[PDB]
Amino acid sequence: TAGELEFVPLAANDDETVGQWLDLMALAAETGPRAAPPCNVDMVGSLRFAPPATALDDWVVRSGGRVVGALRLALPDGAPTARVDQLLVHPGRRRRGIGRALWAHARELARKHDRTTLTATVVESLPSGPAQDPGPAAFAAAMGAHRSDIPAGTHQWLDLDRHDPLADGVPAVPAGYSLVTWGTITPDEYAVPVSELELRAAQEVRTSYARQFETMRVGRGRRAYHTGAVHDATGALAGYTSVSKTTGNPAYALQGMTVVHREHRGHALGTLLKLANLEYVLRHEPEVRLVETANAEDNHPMIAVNAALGFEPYDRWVFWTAEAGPSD
């Protein structure tokens, strides 16, 4: 084992290592999937602000005193899994065993932390979209992982220079409803409704958990655009939608989920929300051209509604699991 590679914990206040890790990512992305390039604010931020009720176990591996690879695990409280958020080898040092060594490290950490399975997201090909590097899938299989049975993510791209869903402007707001907007922090009055929109003083635990996500994203320098639909006669939150923007990459943005309350369906609110919030976005983020989103592949309509707005299916986010295995 030892000699060639050194395992070192990745720590936010370690400027040099952190720097070499940002560079590794930058270098890797040049020959990785289609993606917004890593944002350094977002990435250094991901070392200071963890998601709620989640422990981060981050590592770097070195050859000759330099970072040649990285492993980040997310450990959700209570759960028996360890999510592999990053397992990355310098693109000029692949096929020497590093990945294998990182993966043995991941299992040893899962085991130590009382987790029985590792999960990962692996980029693969869509049945008829553009062929993707098969390496990461063959690595996964070779580590002993299996394709899980939860349906994969259909990962889509809208490109505003090839289609403008706003060509006819934003549609008419249906009678009885008004629109509202907010930024990175949910207004006090919609906190509870947002959190319940898709379902005592258990609301506080909920509201507080959501607030930790919102601050995580700000800590990571992300801006966010929300549009809400309100039912005037009841003042109920009928639906909302969002878009997330990293400090980096002025041309890129992330399209979030669109939610519409069960009792307010049938009024094209979903398309209204998407279109109106996009208008909102471009007004403050005029350089945005490339918007990404992802849906459960098994839900064709939601995907279709996105296609109608010009998002095209690009690549496939497949879920894998593996056993942490015995310590003994």
Ligand X SMILES: CC(=O)SCCNC(=O)CCNC(=O)[C@H](O)C(C)(C)COP(=O)(O)OP(=O)(O)OC[C@H]1O[C@@H](n2cnc3c(N)ncnc32)[C@H](O)[C@@H]1OP(=O)(O)O
| Tokens (6 digits) for 137 | 């899938």
* Contact code string over 182-221 relative to ligand X, x by CB under 6 A: ----------------------------------------
96 binds ligand X (CB under 6 A): yes
CA distance 181 to 255: 16
24 binds ligand X (CB under 6 A): no
Of the residues 26, 53, 55, 138, which one makes contact with ligand X according to CB under 6 A: 138
Nearest to 166 by CA among 16, 79, 283: 283
5 binds ligand X (CB under 6 A): no
* Contact code string over 294-323 relative to ligand X, x by CB under 6 A: --------------------------x---
Stretch that binds ligand X, among 90-98, 160-168, 203-211, 217-225 (CB under 6 A): 90-98
**Residue that has been written with the tokens 């944002």 in this structure:** 39
Nearest to 252 by CA among 44, 40, 39, 85: 39
Q: Which residues pair with 6 in a beta bridge?
A: 62
Of residues 118 and 288, the one with the C-beta less far from ligand X: 118
135 binds ligand X (CB under 6 A): yes
Q: Residue 316 CB, nearest distance to ligand X (Å)? A: 13
E-strand stretches of the chain: 5-9, 54-63, 66-76, 81-89, 117-124, 146-147, 153-159, 177-182, 223-231, 236-245, 252-260, 290-296, 312-323
CA atoms within 13 A on the CB side of 88: 24
87 binds ligand X (CB under 6 A): yes
Residues that bind ligand X (CB under 6 A): 28, 32, 84, 87-89, 94-100, 120, 122, 135-136, 138-140, 142, 145, 320
